[PDB]
């Protein structure tokens, strides 16, 4: 048995959908991310309301790739006035620190059966960028990712 994730009681978990393999490479290399304006606001609000009582997890997936590519923890609030042009979209506004804790490809077929009640019961694999995941579903996702081979 593995009951690690079933036991966590605090934590908030978001899907990260990126169009760009380059942005994923840069994130892993430098432990930073940037989302859209509204994505940054959602993530910033979740980070600031957490108050270190629990982690904000990011489940990264490249749009159209058919798989998740890893997991990171948010490690700062969003700084919105930062160097422009560092991401694929040259206008992207801001930066927050992350810490990647898991880098590997998990096929969508391993996760498609988990559905999200806050997103019309759609498969978690059909989420848009910064879709939040209910903690009870997130536990199931994290277990599958951590145990995939
Ligand atoms: Cl926006």
Experimental technique, in short, is X-ray
Q: Give me ligand 1 centre to Cα 9, in Å.
A: 31
Phi, psi dihedrals of residue 75, rounded to the nearest 5°: -130, 10
| DSSP classification of residue 128 | P
18 assigned ligand-binding residue:
yes
Question: CA 77, CA 103: separation in Å to the nearest integer?
Answer: 23
Domain of residue 41, residue span = 1-149
What is the 39 CA–ligand 1 centroid distance (Å)? 7
Find out whether 83 is annotated in a ligand binding site: no
Tell me the CA–centroid distance for residue 55 and ligand 1, in Å.
Answer: 24
Q: How many domains does the chain have?
A: 1
- Check if the beta carbon of residue 15 is closer than 8 Å to that of residue 129: yes
Q: 101 φ, ψ to 5°? A: -120, -5
Other residues' Cβ atoms within 10 Å of the Cβ of residue 101 = 12
Distance from C-alpha of 75 to C-alpha of 57, rounded to nearest angstrom = 10
CA 44 to ligand 1 center in whole angstroms? 14
Overall residue count recorded for the chain in this entry: 149
Residues in contact with 88: Cβ distance below 8 Å, sequence separation at least 6, in sequence order: 19, 20, 22, 23
Q: How many CB atoms lie within 10 A of CB 12?
A: 19
Q: Which of 129, 126, 112 is CA-nearest to residue 60?
A: 129
Burial class (CB in 10 A: 0-12, 13-18, 19+), 109: exposed
Beta-strand (E) ranges in 2-149? 12-18, 32-33, 56-62, 67-74, 96-102, 106-107, 115-116, 122-123, 132-133
Determine contact, residues 25/6, Cβ cutoff 8 Å: no
Neighbours of 62 (CB within 10 A): 18
Phi, psi for residue 31 in degrees, rounded to 5 = 55, 50
């Amino acid at each position: 048995e593995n009951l690690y994730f079933q036991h966590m009681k605090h934590g908030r978990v978001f899907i990260i959908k990126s169009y760009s393999e380059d942005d994923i490479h840069r994130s892993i290399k430098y432990n930073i991310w940037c989302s859209t304006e509204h994505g940054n606001k959602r993530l910033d609000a979740a980070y600031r309301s957490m108050n270190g009582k629990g982690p904000v997890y990011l489940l990264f997936s490249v749009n159209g790739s058919g798989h998740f590519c890893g997991v990171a923890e948010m490690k700062s609030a969003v700084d919105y006035n930062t160097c422009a042009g560092v991401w694929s979209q040259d206008k992207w506004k801001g930066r927050f620190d992350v810490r990647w804790i898991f880098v590997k490809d998990v096929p969508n077929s391993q996760l498609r059966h988990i559905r999200l009640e806050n997103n019309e019961n759609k498969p978690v694999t059909n989420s848009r960028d910064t879709q939040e995941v209910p903690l009870e579903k997130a536990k199931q996702v994290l277990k599958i990712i951590a145990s995939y081979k």
